[PDB]
Amino acid sequence: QEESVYALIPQPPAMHTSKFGGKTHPAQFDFGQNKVQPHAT
Amino acid sequence: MREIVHIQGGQCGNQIGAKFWEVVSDEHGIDPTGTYHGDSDLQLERINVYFNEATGGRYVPRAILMDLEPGTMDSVRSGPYGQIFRPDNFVFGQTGAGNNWAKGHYTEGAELIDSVLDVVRKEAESCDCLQGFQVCHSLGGGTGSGMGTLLISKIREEYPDRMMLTFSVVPSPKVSDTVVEPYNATLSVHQLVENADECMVLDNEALYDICFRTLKLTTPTFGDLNHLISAVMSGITCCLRFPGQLNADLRKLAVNLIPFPRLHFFMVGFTPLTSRGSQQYRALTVPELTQQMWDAKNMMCAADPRHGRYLTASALFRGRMSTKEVDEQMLNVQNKNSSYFVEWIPNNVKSSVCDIPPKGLKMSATFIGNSTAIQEMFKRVSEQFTAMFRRKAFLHWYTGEGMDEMEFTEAESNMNDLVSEYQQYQDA
Numbered sequence: 268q269e270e271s272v273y274a275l276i277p278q279p280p281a282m283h284t285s286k287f288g289g290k291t292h293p294a295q296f297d298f299g300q301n302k303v304q305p306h307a308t
Numbered sequence: 309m310r311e312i313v314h315i316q317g318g319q320c321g322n323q324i325g326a327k328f329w330e331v332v333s334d335e336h337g338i339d340p341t342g343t344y345h346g347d348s349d350l351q352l353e354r355i356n357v358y359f360n361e362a363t364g365g366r367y368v369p370r371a372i373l374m375d376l377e378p379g380t381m382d383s384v385r386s387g388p389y390g391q392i393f394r395p396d397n398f399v400f401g402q403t404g405a406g407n408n409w410a411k412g413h414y415t416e417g418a419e420l421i422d423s424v425l426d427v428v429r430k431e432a433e434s435c436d437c438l439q440g441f442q443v444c445h446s447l448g449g450g451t452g453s454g455m456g457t458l459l460i461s462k463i464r465e466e467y468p469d470r471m472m473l474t475f476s477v478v479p480s481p482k483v484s485d486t487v488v489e490p491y492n493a494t495l496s497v498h499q500l501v502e503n504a505d506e507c508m509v510l511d512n513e514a515l516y517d518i519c520f521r522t523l524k525l526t527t528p529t530f531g532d533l534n535h536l537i538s539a540v541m542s543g544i545t546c547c548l549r550f551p552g553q554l555n556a557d558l559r560k561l562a563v564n565l566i567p568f569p570r571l572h573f574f575m576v577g578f579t580p581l582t583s584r585g586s587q588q589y590r591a592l593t594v595p596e597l598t599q600q601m602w603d604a605k606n607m608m609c610a611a612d613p614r615h616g617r618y619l620t621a622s623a624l625f626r627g628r629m630s631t632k633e634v635d636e637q638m639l640n641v642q643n644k645n646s647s648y649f650v651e652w653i654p655n656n657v658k659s660s661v662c663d664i665p666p667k668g669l670k671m672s673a674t675f676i677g678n679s680t681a682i683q684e685m686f687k688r689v690s691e692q693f694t695a696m697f698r699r700k701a702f703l704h705w706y707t708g709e710g711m712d713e714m715e716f717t718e719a720e721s722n723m724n725d726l727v728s729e730y731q732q733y734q735d736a
């Protein structure tokens with residue numbers, strides 16, 4: 268309504284990976300055993 | 309800690325395995341009921357190396373009895389100390405073995421390995437920290453020599469880091485308890501050259517004379533020879549089970565004994581050994597024990613020290629004694645008869661000691677020596693093997709079990725490569 272025929276038609280990332288990151292291995296942990304074997308038990 | 313596990317495979321194994329557990333059960337003051345009836349707290353301190361606490365305060369062994377034709381097991385199931393075993397730790401097959409290495413290693417063996425391995429692991433985890441295995445053999449037979457090594461080839465691959473001892477009974481030099489003793493020997497020895505950390509060799513011949521000459525026994529029953537074998541097998545773990553002013557664990561005994569990974573064929577003895585009469589004549593001092601232990605009679609194997617050169621040696625004394633005496637004694641021996649010992653080793657003995665003697669004695673000893681005269685047995689047997697294999701006598705029995713002839717020559721060459729190892733290091 269405002270005589271704006273120019274305004275009539277409008278014409279116009281990887282997350283990251285931490286350094287600490289790592290899978291827990293059965294070492295550096297005093298709660299459990301300290302080996303990994305195929306079919307021991 | 310330092311838990312062991314004991315295997316008894318064969319007729320010999322199942323029988324000397326009886327006397328063995330008969331001795332240890334007394335040594336720790338436990339009755340065949342399985343209850344403890346000793347006096348000291350010292351008995352219960354390291355009992356967990358051989359037993360397993362149960363409900364109501366019982367102690368049952370951690371042995372594994374494996375044998376075809378459970379007949380000989382029905383005996384030990386009925387002996388005085390037959391109530392202590394877990395009935396589950398009994399592995400038996402309804403078929404005979406035939407004093408044949410093949411079927412004990414290929415056909416009948418392969419049908420029970422599923423059970424035996426499922427048995428050994430039930431207790432290889434009951435140990436907080438497993439020390440190593442321990443077996444008993446009969447190299448002439450088929451059960452002890454076929455299933456024995458077959459189980460070992462399995463043991464070595466799931467537990468290579470740990471140690472496995474072997475009190476194998478070897479064939480006799482003059483008499484032959486079996487007509488197919490050679491084939492069962494080499495085919496087993498070839499298995500023992502690759503899959504064994506330590507291997508004593510005991511012969512039924514030397515056990516007789518020691519029971520005849522030294523012990524003056526009139527009728528030596530096999531129950532008496534195994535009161536000897538039991539004596540030495542108990543004499544190895546005295547550092548494990550009991551304190552000592554110089555302890556010596558099982559591992560530090562091999563490291564200190566075998567210079568090369570193949571020369572693990574030892575020679576044992578036990579002292580003191582006197583008749584009922586001579587007990588009142590000879591004193592019990594450290595110079596006495598070392599005089600009889602170094603002798604060429606107490607060698608339970610039929611190999612003469614005065615023919616080869618001692619690579620190393622050992623001694624496990626038991627009793628409140630003077631650790632100066634043992635050291636100067638074992639030094640004098642190397643000093644006087646200084647040709648029986650190699651020269652590229654300055655001092656080639658170890659000397660343990662323990663505060664605790666046997667239950668009835670005050671001072672005892674135990675000997676282990678790795679000589680180069682052991683090559684003689686493998687020479688006497690490698691001749692009998694190649695004698696009859698050259699004409700193929702009794703071979704249709706072995707080949708009938710899917711065996712071949714390469715599995716023979718491999719066994720022989722691997723033995724002849726071992727007899728040379730014991731010759732280079734014999735510089736006369």
Ligand SMILES: Nc1nc2c(ncn2[C@@H]2O[C@H](COP(=O)(O)OP(=O)(O)O)[C@@H](O)[C@H]2O)c(=O)[nH]1
Nearest residue numbers: 318319320407446448449450451452485530533
């Ligand atoms: N110290 C001792 N050795 C035995 C005894 N019985 C058999 N042996 C040896 O066992 C050897 C035969 O092997 P054996 O175990 O009986 O038959 P296998 O089941 O086929 O292995 C023979 O050389 C016997 O001398 C025993 O009661 N005491």
